[PDB]
Design a protein around this ligand. Sequence first.
Ligand SMILES: Nc1nc2c(ncn2[C@@H]2O[C@H](COP(=O)(O)OP(=O)(O)O)[C@@H](O)[C@H]2O)c(=O)[nH]1
Ligand code: ALF
Ligand SMILES: [Mg+2]
Lengths: 131, 316
Amino acid sequence: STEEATRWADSFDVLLSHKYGVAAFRAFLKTEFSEENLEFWLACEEFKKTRSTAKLVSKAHRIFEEFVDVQAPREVNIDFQTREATRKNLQEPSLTCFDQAQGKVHSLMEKDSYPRFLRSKMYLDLLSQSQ
Amino acid sequence: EVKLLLLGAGESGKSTIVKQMKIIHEDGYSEDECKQYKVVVYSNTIQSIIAIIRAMGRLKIDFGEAARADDARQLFVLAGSAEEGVMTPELAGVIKRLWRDGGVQACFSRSREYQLNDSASYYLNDLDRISQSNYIPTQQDVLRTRVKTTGIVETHFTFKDLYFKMFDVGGQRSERKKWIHCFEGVTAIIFCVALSDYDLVLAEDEEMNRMHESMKLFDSICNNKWFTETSIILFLNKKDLFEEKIKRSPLTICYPEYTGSNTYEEAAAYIQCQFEDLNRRKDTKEIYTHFTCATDTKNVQFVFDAVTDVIIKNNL
Ligand SMILES: Nc1nc2c(ncn2[C@@H]2O[C@H](COP(=O)(O)OP(=O)(O)O)[C@@H](O)[C@H]2O)c(=O)[nH]1
Ligand code: ALF
Ligand SMILES: [Mg+2]
């Protein structure tokens, strides 16, 4: 448990590769009102696993409506260039439709939220309680 | 207790004011903390030169020398090479040749026509220093870094026997639906405005003037019933960048009716007037305005001291 909790600090991507690291980071992001970033990122990971075209087209539309559109209830913080590229990609959806937007959101979490996670009371409690 | 909100549009200087509170009123930046910003300095540098190169297509600008074409290809391939915080001599040299190219510089001069970090030239002009294998970011290098804020971040610190509960937020349009969460029982707002925004467009809407956006947002905040009793402090920030820019880009871009001079004192004064005019309860409520350079510790310390005095005086 302590080796796993300490592994989350090795890099953001190592944190993301652990189910319990993802869950902890989610709880942390809720306290900072930025959990849409993680839920968008996870949605994109799931999208890339899709095996049928009808399923792919529907999920691309749902992800866009939920997270990417300017009126989206959980609109992610991405620039116009990134949002527009995504919009254009949605006309003929493929598995790389969200790559640009997902990369931007990954960078946003990695550089902003994740360093604060590693210094948080929440993470420090998890460490001290581990094992 | 003082609940203090740092508000303003994207890139206005909010988190930089937050860095200054750590420097002045909390624990400061240790060398180890500085070292943690190295990969950010590198990323900001690499992303900035990439942005200028990319824009050269939109802008119909050629390289001063043909040999830079291969440097540009090399830059794009290498762009990931420094994510572990090592700028290779190869990458360093590629960037140096591109930044010194006359086409690249012509594009840099026209950066209002695209999206470029304010600290781009700061870092690019210091490439020799920052590219050394032993490089440790200085405190000013840290202050100059660009990391976009998402969500709402609370910190605390003490000053003049007051306990400050400080809230830093994201400034982009997408973020602003979250701000209401922190609007209860607010003692003071520092509302940041990038003076140097007057000729830029929003990263999230490239057909919106950034200062016009800031005005709309200040209108909204200043007159919000949540803040009737809140001390409203206006930081007309990036005064240093504004001083330089005003000598080459006319204020009429933002305010077509302006008939004053394109000088720091007159143009700055006019912007102050435009923001202060948005107060629809002038008989009832003050705006406490300061011209700031958020990256200048001495300046922010002086201004924040003055601000604290206003808050004490307003809570007697
Ligand atoms: N030269 C200069 N740079 C500034 C000033 N204020 C902020 N910056 C820089 O502008 C960028 C955006 O600032 P930031 O605090 O991240 O904006 P925020 O989005 O409002 O938090 C950063 O790279 C800062 O270093 C200033 O007054 N002068
Ligand atoms: F653009 Al910001 F904090 F408003 F990074
Ligand atoms: Mg910020």
